[PDB]
Design a protein around this ligand. Structure first.
Ligand SMILES: NC(=O)C1=CN([C@@H]2O[C@H](COP(=O)(O)OP(=O)(O)OC[C@H]3O[C@@H](n4cnc5c(N)ncnc54)[C@H](O)[C@@H]3O)[C@@H](O)[C@H]2O)C=CC1
Ligand SMILES: NC(=O)C1=CN([C@@H]2O[C@H](COP(=O)(O)OP(=O)(O)OC[C@H]3O[C@@H](n4cnc5c(N)ncnc54)[C@H](O)[C@@H]3O)[C@@H](O)[C@H]2O)C=CC1
Ligand SMILES: NC(=O)C1=CN([C@@H]2O[C@H](COP(=O)(O)OP(=O)(O)OC[C@H]3O[C@@H](n4cnc5c(N)ncnc54)[C@H](O)[C@@H]3O)[C@@H](O)[C@H]2O)C=CC1
Ligand SMILES: NC(=O)C1=CN([C@@H]2O[C@H](COP(=O)(O)OP(=O)(O)OC[C@H]3O[C@@H](n4cnc5c(N)ncnc54)[C@H](O)[C@@H]3O)[C@@H](O)[C@H]2O)C=CC1
Ligand SMILES: NC(=O)C1=CN([C@@H]2O[C@H](COP(=O)(O)OP(=O)(O)OC[C@H]3O[C@@H](n4cnc5c(N)ncnc54)[C@H](O)[C@@H]3O)[C@@H](O)[C@H]2O)C=CC1
Lengths: 275, 281, 280, 275, 275
């Protein structure tokens, strides 16, 4: 099976890294393309054995499954450029935030009737095979196409099919989510350092606690509030810390965040659609 | 692996921590369940029924656990430790490794109590967390005055089977308690609230819970395997003008970073305060 | 359930004495005429109420102690010392003394009473006014000399007007902050919620009724469910819906921390008051 | 009398469980329909004894009283599905938040001329027979229809007739109301645990306190301020706790919540009334 | 001239880097010592040509000027260990935060009368020869000693003699100062990225603006408020941004910071002195 990436940045490197680390794709059967063939993501991809090229045309003619891995606003430019080269064998998987199946199918249908389009939202932890991924199938996506997508992306993390009208919300939760965790971990490390731990130890312990707590949840039947109960003993240290999180409106900040990321994703797509 | 060949473990107290550690210990295969004994006064309890299903030997007699164990974990609340040490103290023999898990409780307080019986108790203090139950714990430990060199080697091997383990000087353990001991509760509050956000934006609760937990899992895993500063990694995720940099701004406008600093601090300070009040009495 | 030869007496004839007596008679386990209350303000509003029930009223605490087998101390906490000095020589071996006072410890009660006769039988309880509708939340702790049959009797009596359970005494100040003061948080919340309903177009009477019915049913759901309150809150909030929007404005205000602050302030104040009674 | 539910989720389970606990209705005189059968609520209603079917038409033909228990945006889809199947004998009770009698009649009136519609607002504590219900009768609902609906819903809690223009306000007060109570109970338990109580005992005592206070109010002639006065003695623990609530603006948060819920209810019906 | 560093961490590397970059000391005439002879600061120092060693004894016997570059609490341990090796040729320059001349002279005078002690406060930008440095001379510091110190440290940044009772305040301002600037620069970069700049460009421009504004001030006669006036035109963009800094209490946060750093430095030295 032949894979290609339009655009070779953070997202394309993470995906090729996980795919090849999962063992489901050889690196030499993967090609990516970028105009700036001297990006540091281009270097990492070439060290990894991926075929690199500046011409978007060679990538499409190489691959069956084609990931669009450029920024949202470049997508119209990308699609006008390769639209004429989309054979019937292709599955076009769009990764860009907010870009709708409708808009991709409209641009590509001007060239070939019935382009096969899958929209996915992912995140950078696919690079360690722990990404969170949802996808939606376009009008002309065959049933097997959605099964190939799910098999492929389940090798690098969690995957499930969703209705397209959830994906902007997913983008704000698990698309932006790693950036919230990274911010939280830097602060928790700061807390550790304040109380006397060396930086390196504080980072390791915070990340390890974040990891174990999430895994606990994923493997537990129970509610996040219930697992929290089990950690905090009456009068003890944890319940005291939880009180200071509550007094600052900790929960509402996280809600504000997911909301802000989602709304901004919708807002960007209105300006894309208006234009 | 001969460290675990004939080794017997006991837990004084059979609650959340005993079950988490026994659950990870048995799931790791380092110990068979029947080689483990847990004791508690309220036998018919929530966690003591899980431990019996695993195959752990249970008993209401703290002394039976002492007679059974090579390594004896103290899995009771901190204020019970002196009450427990007075009880089984005359039973701790030279062959024992006493491992205190209680938050705050110093190696000094345990050694002072136990040395009024046999002169050289081998005491190790640890701080761990519940994710050892899925073998992803965060554990540190400090060896006491009489803890032999191999004693720390065995303790590290035992607790590394259920997660990260490293030795520390004792005076850090209270700050570790505020960071990784209380850590999981911070993550569960965060995950609950991310899901509320997901739900507010139109996601089913089940999907929002799965997705936020997977997102925290993957991000923490990325950090542990990366050679790079948590700031660089967030820089990689936020593209110019994008959804993510917008969401990071509302986190900054609420003082998100400082709330987690307050939290680690409040936990560490409460841990010290509880131990200074126990030291008074 | 009816304990024939059980005479009950109340020192103090106010809010709590009225609430306990109304619950006890409504439950039918005590006829009103086998109950006696005493107060110096025989022209109080709750004294009027208890006499309409048929409860035997009297101004003399000695008359209450001599009538009673179980004796409720339902006076302000600073009054408990003076009361125990007035009646302590009238205490007999047959009495079970139940103190209702916030924060006043069993130790303090026994030290005062044992100056008069050894081995007084003391139980400390924390309750709340909803016993008046038989939905109280009560805990109790037995003293040094209470017989095991005394706590079982107190528990039987008090279970008939709400939830009742034995606790260790050192939990009672925190229970005071949770369920003793707790009805007052509910009343403040129901007044506010009704205000919200009036703001959005509801008549005041309707808003009060619906608000109270919603708190009552949610509480009943939790008591009869196995599940976490968070889990029941997940069940009521649908994606993007009206409820998750409201929960967000609650979270932005630190709603949860305010109720932790409240329980904490009530408990600390309770300890503080006793800790300076112990100084006097 | 036969009862049907279009949509077999949280509300249908709550009403079915309450009606049969009340004994007004035999489980097997209840029928519910849902496309997504693998739902948790379908498994719960099955064991109750309710008849389950994927076809909304079978529910309509079974029912004398037909509850509309789908998400508010599904309502227009549903009324077009079974509109031809509504007969003269039906009483159509809409349980959807925000959806007006006007919009329901307009859809249904295109088929049979005189649809008997009732709008109701309820909440999940019907499942323990302590719900709070209001209802408005539509244009063709006869006097006997309102009486029958009142009788049915009074068996699972409080029920009264309102003008329809109140029901959006009711939704924010008593419809969303249980969720405010669950948040408060969880936080009240956290405070109990902070001060030394076991979680189980603190959950139990907080819920019992809210239950007794609410019942006290419902059985009282008195303003909630007066009851509050009765609990707080001079200098005492309660009046100190009420000060820290007042200092956080506790009352305004609850007003904010009711208002935010009511606004959202109106906003969604504006979106429906445009689409 | 012979220099030695007790402790080879961030501070010792920065100083040796600037000194050798200034051209006033050859790297091979510099020796440092550390127990953890495998620190990454140890590696940088060895790549640089400094003599490394684990024994604190060899450093003292190598150097004339001896910097104490360990953490404050290690200083008593350090001084008890080498006190007996302090010849009369040595100048002991203590860099540790908060540690007083008094306490160093007391420990060292137990071995040799009249130890020559200079207390300095510095910061990490000495590594690019732009540090801010103050020093105070001890009781037995000869006049030339203070002149050797000032000449040495003026080659790697600003230097001036102060009374010792200012140094804790200096520690909070220019000792901790670089950490405030680094925090500010990360946030300004975030602001740039929010408004559409690539990360790399936003960091470069912020740092360049921070640098030019400081240099402007250092070379200007005028008051920081006056230079601010000259930047903001009536109604323009700058004065708008300055208003949002004022509304959040920007200035007071910076005052809080310097204060917090200073008080904590005093507080640590009381516990050192008490112990
Ligand atoms: N970084 C993240 O956290 C994730 C990013 N995404 C999405 O993936 C897309 C890119 O993500 P990043 O990898 O952060 O982008 P990036 O900014 O790292 O680099 C994107 C690549 O596209 C290349 N490119 C630009 N114009 C091109 C053209 N005309 N033809 C071919 N290649 C071109 C750029 O040179 C660069 O190599 C965005 O739409 C983003 O929403 C989604 C999931 C996670
Ligand atoms: N749960 C957590 O998240 C962690 C807890 N810890 C520490 O572990 C200890 C207990 O942790 P949890 O298990 O959370 O408490 P827990 O209360 O779930 O278990 C306590 C156990 O001690 C038993 N116990 C009480 N008195 C006893 C006695 N006299 N003899 C024997 N057993 C007795 C209780 O019956 C109960 O089984 C505490 O000191 C806590 O600080 C430390 C790390 C993680
Ligand atoms: N009111 C409440 O919500 C609850 C009350 N309590 C406790 O119950 C006790 C009383 O509470 P309330 O009944 O609300 O007080 P209250 O002030 O309504 O009535 C107190 C009674 O004590 C009587 N009294 C004063 N001096 C007396 C004396 N020397 N001899 C006999 N009677 C005397 C007064 O006349 C008054 O009738 C307090 O200790 C309080 O902590 C505990 C739980 C809830
Ligand atoms: N959950 C609550 O707390 C309360 C809910 N409500 C209202 O009740 C309605 C539903 O409430 P929930 O039951 O919580 O929603 P829910 O999502 O639990 O159940 C919705 C049901 O509709 C079914 N459904 C979806 N499309 C359908 C279709 N085309 N034909 C037939 N059935 C279909 C789904 O399978 C699901 O079972 C909403 O409009 C809400 O406003 C009002 C009072 C309280
Ligand atoms: N990093 C900064 O921003 C500045 C630090 N300082 C001061 O300089 C001192 C250290 O600063 P950092 O370089 O941040 O320390 P650091 O933590 O980078 O490393 C200090 C060095 O001391 C070594 N060391 C520990 N015990 C030792 C011993 N017994 N004998 C010899 N070496 C030993 C450590 O192994 C490490 O190499 C502190 O007192 C600090 O206040 C002052 C100016 C700026």
């Amino acid at each position: 099976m032949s894979v290609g990436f339009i655009g070779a940045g953070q997202l394309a490197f993470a995906l090729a890294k996980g795919f090849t680390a999962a063992g489901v794709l050889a690196a030499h059967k993967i090609m990516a393309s970028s105009p700036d063939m001297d990006l540091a993501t281009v270097s990492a991809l070439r060290k990894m054995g991926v075929k690199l090229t500046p011409h978007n045309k060679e990538t499409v003619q190489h691959s069956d499954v084609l990931f669009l891995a450029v920024k949202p606003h470049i997508i119209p430019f990308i699609l006008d450029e390769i639209g004429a080269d989309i054979e019937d064998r292709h599955i076009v998987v769009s990764c860009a935030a907010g870009v709708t199946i409708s808009s991709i199918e409209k641009k590509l249908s001007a060239f070939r009737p019935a382009p096969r389009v899958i929209r996915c939202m992912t995140n950078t932890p696919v690079v360690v095979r722990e990404g969170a991924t949802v996808y939606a199938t376009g009008t002309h996506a065959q049933v097997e196409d959605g099964r190939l997508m799910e098999q492929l992306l389940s090798s690098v993390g969690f995957c499930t099919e969703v209705e397209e009208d959830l994906i902007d919300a997913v983008t704000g939760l698990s698309g932006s989510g790693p950036a919230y965790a990274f911010t939280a971990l830097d602060a928790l490390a700061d807390g550790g350092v304040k109380m006397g731990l060396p930086r390196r130890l504080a980072v390791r312990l915070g990340a390890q606690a974040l990891l174990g707590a999430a895994k606990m949840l994923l493997h537990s039947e129970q509610h996040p509030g219930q697992l929290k109960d089990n950690v905090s003993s009456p009068g003890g240290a944890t319940i005291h810390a939880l009180h200071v999180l509550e007094s600052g409106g900790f929960r509402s900040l996280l809600i504000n965040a997911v909301e802000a990321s989602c709304i901004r994703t919708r807002e960007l797509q209105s300006m894309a659609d208006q234009e």
